[PDB]
Amino acid sequence: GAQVSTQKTGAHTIHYTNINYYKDAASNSANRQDFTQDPSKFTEPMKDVMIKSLPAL
Amino acid sequence: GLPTMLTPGSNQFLTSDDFQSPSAMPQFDVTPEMKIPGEVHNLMEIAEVDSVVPVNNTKENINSMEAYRIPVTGGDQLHTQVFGFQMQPGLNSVFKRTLLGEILNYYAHWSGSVKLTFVFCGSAMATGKFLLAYSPPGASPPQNRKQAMLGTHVIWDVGLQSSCVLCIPWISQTHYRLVQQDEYTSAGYVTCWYQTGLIVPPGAPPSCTILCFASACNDFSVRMLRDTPFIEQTQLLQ
Amino acid sequence: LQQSGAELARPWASVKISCQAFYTFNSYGMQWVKQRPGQGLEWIGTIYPGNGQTSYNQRFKGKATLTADKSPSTAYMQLISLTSEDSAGCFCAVVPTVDFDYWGQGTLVTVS
Amino acid sequence: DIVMSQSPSSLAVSVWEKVTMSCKSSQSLLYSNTQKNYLAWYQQKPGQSPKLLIYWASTRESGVPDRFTGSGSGTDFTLTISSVKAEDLAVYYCQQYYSYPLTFGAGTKLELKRA
Amino acid sequence: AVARVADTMPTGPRNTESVPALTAVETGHTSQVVPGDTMQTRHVKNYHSRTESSIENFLCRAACVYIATYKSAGGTPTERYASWRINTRQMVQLRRKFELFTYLRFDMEITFVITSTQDPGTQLAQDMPVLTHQIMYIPPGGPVPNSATDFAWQSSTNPSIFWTEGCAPARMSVPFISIGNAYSNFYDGWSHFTQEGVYGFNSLNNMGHIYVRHVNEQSLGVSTSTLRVYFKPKHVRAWVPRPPRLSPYVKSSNVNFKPTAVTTERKDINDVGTLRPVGYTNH
């Protein structure tokens, strides 16, 4: 199960291979490549959606 | 069996490596995950939230709530600076202890535009105007409204809306700026001057109060993780 | 500028000195200087009018208390616990943050 | 505290002799906003209240001759007295506008020397 | 990368009613003003990214958690082994990083760095073969050994690791072993339903102990050691962010503190850093 993925490079043969040898899910390496983000929960927890251009009140 | 040759760097222990490791207790059944509200997927989702800025931290004010209040009065003025502080969001007495500076001091480089929100906390009948200027680090800090009106500045009128977000842009010659800045990567100054003055009807309080906020805009970025020079100890805590 | 010519005081007691002139209060603070024949000029303190600020020299903190009201056109300085070391000529001056300008005459305070 | 030195503390001189006197500051009384030294020069006539000689350390006052001229910058200054006359025998005190305690200098006593 | 930051679309002059600068924070809403709303800006393709500030990259670095020392001599058998209730509050560098979030759920890598120093006195060892350390993990409730050379060092069920000296530091991984659904960093509550007992997170901490000993009697001489444990959380998720702590820690089982100021001190409110002469702006 050779899981070939892309490496991390600076934007202007870059792939790496990784096997999982151990029979436990906690023995895998770190998930250093999950970059989801959603500041909406904290930045805008509003019931009525506020538009920038419109006045607040 | 298979012939190998141990490369340099073996038998060492790097603290920031990604290696697999044999599990201590195999086939452990982990408890299921439940949907706790408020997941943080990235730390900039925290750094993008406003926090109050103690801009009045002079002499005996740091041991009270007075550090957060900016005093404004309604006299002649027009010749008085309301506040001035350098733009140093990692190393500055003003906002190194805010929410932004605490996340910044965990790193070495930063970039992007920083917002500043000003709230008017006066009466409901008091009017007034203010000039919120920002000067790039080209010459000495301004000293009268003349020398401050040239740089990037917004004019703030208090009305039914009680907030004006002076958005400090990102103007620099390096893509990133040091956190612990110096003369080379200096960022400049931020002042604020009266433009008309506070006018209150008879019976209203003559003096009012402004609070300052701080947060990172949607093009903020951070790099070079490091330890914070803010928390220390002597021996183990028992 | 008008300042009374002299004051005779008893030691271990207070003196109130007055200053008065045509100039009004825009951005000009009121300077107080103690002059003694043996030594040079010594600053006591000032009281700026725009922010109504009061400032005193460390040496005179606890010794000189100065007050000024808008109506009297007069600035005042009070000294207490007077000793022979306080016998001196005291001058009041103006300052428009542009110069110390002039002082004028003074009270020849005598602690006797 | 900013202290103001004066050297010489006093000097006796005759008529028609160009005299000077230095007043050196323990801190440069020159700020980088307007480049205007914060130094004042003062003449206290014998048994008299002092009067202004030079403000901004560069400019003269009315009723004052060219034998009173400010000169210098930074932290060292002097007052050139070109052609002395019978109205210069007095004590002169320099002063600084910069640090809140407005300490005056030591005080040069320009003395008169007769026949 | 996938964490790329937003670009600034260009903008020219304007004269509109839609003022984006004026807002109202009383609604508890952080404004979303990009610099394009308060001035003229230019189209730049911003290539910066936020990879270095994600949670996994922010936490997946090992930090010291305990420092225990023990001997191999005779007498006072409380010195022939070391004990440690598993806490993450005794070393501050990691405690402060964990105390930005309320709840945490992750796996863990544990690496042990053991260093041994010989002790003074007469009858020294001359030559001594390599030493060997045993690191037994005792879940809450197991039989605690009272000294070295005890029955309970069998570890017929407990995970134990044997490490000869002169070998790469030892390391093993542990899955998410909590009772609930997340390691609660804070617990505003009591232990007994009558609102008495131990107040704070000190009651949620039930992880067991860790015991270490020398498997070598030696006989000829004394040799102390120093166990250092390192925690590296991986596969980490965090919830409910917190404000960072301000006053220094005092206890390892409480949140107690002393009242400290909010920041350092300036000279004045309008002090830009340089020394200013007096005037009608700075005074």
Place this chain on the structure above:
Amino acid sequence: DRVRSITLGNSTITTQECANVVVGYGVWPSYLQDNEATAEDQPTQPDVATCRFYTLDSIQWQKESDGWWWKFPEALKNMGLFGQNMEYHYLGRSGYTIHVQCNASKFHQGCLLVVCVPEAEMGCSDVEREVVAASLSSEDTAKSFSRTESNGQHTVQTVVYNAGMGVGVGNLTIFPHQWINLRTNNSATIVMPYINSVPMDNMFRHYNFTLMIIPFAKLEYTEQASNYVPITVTVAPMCAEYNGLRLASHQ
């Protein structure tokens, strides 16, 4: 807009100067789905008899006041049927809706901060000791902050700029918050969902969260105006349920 009306159970709340309704961390209070449940037993669900507004006690905003805090859900021990189903059940789960209101004249001035601090653990006043339950939350009144340091031997450290938790008071704006600015606002609503690590918990030995009110811009006025500006808090549990019926306990 500026007019809101919140109806729950048999109680309505009308406001004519409202800012908005900040809704927790994004989610909205709901019942426990069966994917997450761990209680083996059938849960009771009193909808109308529990999910209604309760008005707590009133406090007085002086010119020298500095803050107050209530702890939930312990603050509702004796509030109708919710205070009965707290005493009669071993497990409880519910979301809240905190409406805080303070009207003063256009001629007054001031500001407030209304935070909901989940798991607000507090530190003692005398280090190397511990707090007691009588010091964390009174029976029905609001606990106060102090301007100076608290010197007691078994009380919480009530100094305000440290917020009694050890954090800077300025950085409290992470948690759901609104601002009662007497210039433009009259009240502030917060809908806080159930924030906890275990799906259900006994609501006597676990204060779910702490509500705080801290004045940043203090109240000042003139002698013509009235000198009694009170604040009232009104909370309503939402979608409450319980399990594990036992005898009456902690009554």
